[PDB]
Amino acid sequence: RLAVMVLRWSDGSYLEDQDMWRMSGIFRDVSLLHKPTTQISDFHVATRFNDDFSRAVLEAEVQMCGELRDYLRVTVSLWQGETQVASGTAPFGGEIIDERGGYADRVTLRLNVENPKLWSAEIPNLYRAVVELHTADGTLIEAEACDVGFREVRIENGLLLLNGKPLLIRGVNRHEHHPLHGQVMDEQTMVQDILLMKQNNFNAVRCSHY
Amino acid sequence: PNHPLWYTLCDRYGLYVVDEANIETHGMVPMNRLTDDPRWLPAMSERVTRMVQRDRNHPSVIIWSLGNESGHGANHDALYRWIKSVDPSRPVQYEGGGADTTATDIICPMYARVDEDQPFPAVPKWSIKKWLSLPGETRPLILCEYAHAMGNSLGGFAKYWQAFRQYPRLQGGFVWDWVDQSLIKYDENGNPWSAYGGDFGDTPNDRQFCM
Ligand SMILES: [Mg+2]
Ligand code: NA
Ligand code: NA
C-alpha cells in the first residue's frame, strides 16, 4: 500500500503563479520502474555537423551506477528504420579532466554519420539510438533508447538558424488544459492539438509556462 | 569642395558641413570602371588629399566624403583609409556601390524610402528602418540625399521626420536640393525668363531635371 499526502499549497506555490486555473492533485502518470543494480543512470545525445551538413558526429555520453568492472561495455547503435547505420562500443572510463583524473563511471561514444537525414518541423526525420549496457562477450544488462533528430540550432550574426537556415517561427503558446479533466493530459488531446496546429500552418509551440 | 569663404561662413553662422571630393564618374559603365582602376588612383587621390589639406582646420566640416556616384572601387577603400589615418577627428562617408560598403562610416543612401524596400540587384535601397537592423549592421544611417524637391514635390516628408525621431540610429539626411539650377535668358524685349536644359541649343540634354 502506497500513501500520498498532497498539499494544495506550499512554498513551491510562490513560484507557480501562472495565469491559469489553480488546481491540485496527482495529475500526471504514476509508475513503477525496475532497473538492475548495475544500470544506465544517465545519457546525453549530441549531434555535430560540418559546414554543409553532409557529415555528422553523434556523441553519446553514458553514465552508470553500480560496481565498476573491466568487463563492462556500452554500445550505442543508431538505426534508420530496420537498418543499422552506425555503432560504437567502449569500456567505461572517460578521458582525464583534471588533476584527480576522469570519470571512471562514464564513457563517451562517437559515431560518424554520412549524409544524415536532417530533422526539422518541415521534415521530422528521426533516427533511433539504442544504448546497450552489457558485458564484453555480449550479455545484455539493460538497454535504454531515444528518438534522435539530426539538427543544429545556433545564433549567428543576429539570426536564429536551424541547420544553417534562418527560422520563421509560426508559433503558439499552449497550456495543458482539458475542459472536463482540468490539467490532466491524454494522448488523444495532445494529438488532436498537434494536428490542428500543423493544419493551420503552425510550426512551433511554447510550453507556457512549465 | 566649395569656395573657401563658404566654410568660414559655416564656421561663424553655425552649420554642419559634409565636405566632398570633386569625384563623380556617374556616366561610366559600370559606374566604378575608373574608380576600381589603379591607373586612376593618382588623379582620384589628389582630389581627396588636397581637399583635406585645405579644409581640415574648419570646425564646420564634420564629415569627409569621397565624392558622389562613382560606384565602389578599390581606389575608394585606399582613400578612405588615407583620410582615417591622417585625420581621425572626422568620420568618412561615401554612398557609391550600395551606401553601406567598407568605404563608409555612415550608411548614407540616396532616396531610400521610409517603409518601402527597393530591392535593385547589387545596389538595393532598403527601407531605412529595415537597413539599420540587417544582420551585422551597426552603423548610423544618414541619407546623403532624400526628398527630391523637383517642382511640386516633398510629398511624404513628414514620414521621414516621424522615423528620424523614433529611431535613434536614423540621424536624418540632406534634402536634394537647395536651389533650382535654372539660368536667365532674355526675350526680344529684354525681359528675363528662367531657362533649363535644352534652352541654349545644348544637345543632348536632360531638360528640367536641373531644377
Ligand atoms: Mg502571469
Ligand atoms: Na534618430
Ligand atoms: Na537633378
UniProtKB/Swiss-Prot annotation, chain B:
- Tell me yes or no: is Metal-binding among this UniProt entry's keywords: yes
* Domain of life assignment: Bacteria
Q: Where is the active site?
A: 69 (proton donor), 145 (nucleophile)
Which residues of the complete protein appear here? Answer: 394 to 604 of 1024
Inducing factors = By allolactose.
Q: Which keywords label this protein?
A: Glycosidase, Hydrolase, Magnesium, Manganese, Metal-binding, Sodium
Question: Which amino acids does the record list as binding Na(+)?
Answer: 209
Which GO-annotated molecular functions does the record name? Answer: alkali metal ion binding; beta-galactosidase activity; carbohydrate binding; identical protein binding; magnesium ion binding
- Gene symbol? lacZ
The entry describes its oligomerization and partners as: Homotetramer.
**What is a biological process (GO) this protein takes part in?**
lactose catabolic process
Question: In UniProt terms, what is the effect of altering residue 209 to A?
Answer: Decreases the stability of the loop 794-804
Binding of Mg(2+) 1: at which residues?
Answer: 24, 26, 69
Binding residues for Mg(2+) 2? 205
Q: What is this protein called?
A: Beta-galactosidase
What changing residue 69 to H does, per the record, is:
Slowly inactivates galactosidase activity by reducing the binding of magnesium. It increases binding specificity
Which GO CC terms are listed, alphabetically? beta-galactosidase complex
Binding residues annotated for substrate, in chain numbering = 69, 145-148
In which family does this protein belong, per the annotation?
Belongs to the glycosyl hydrolase 2 family.
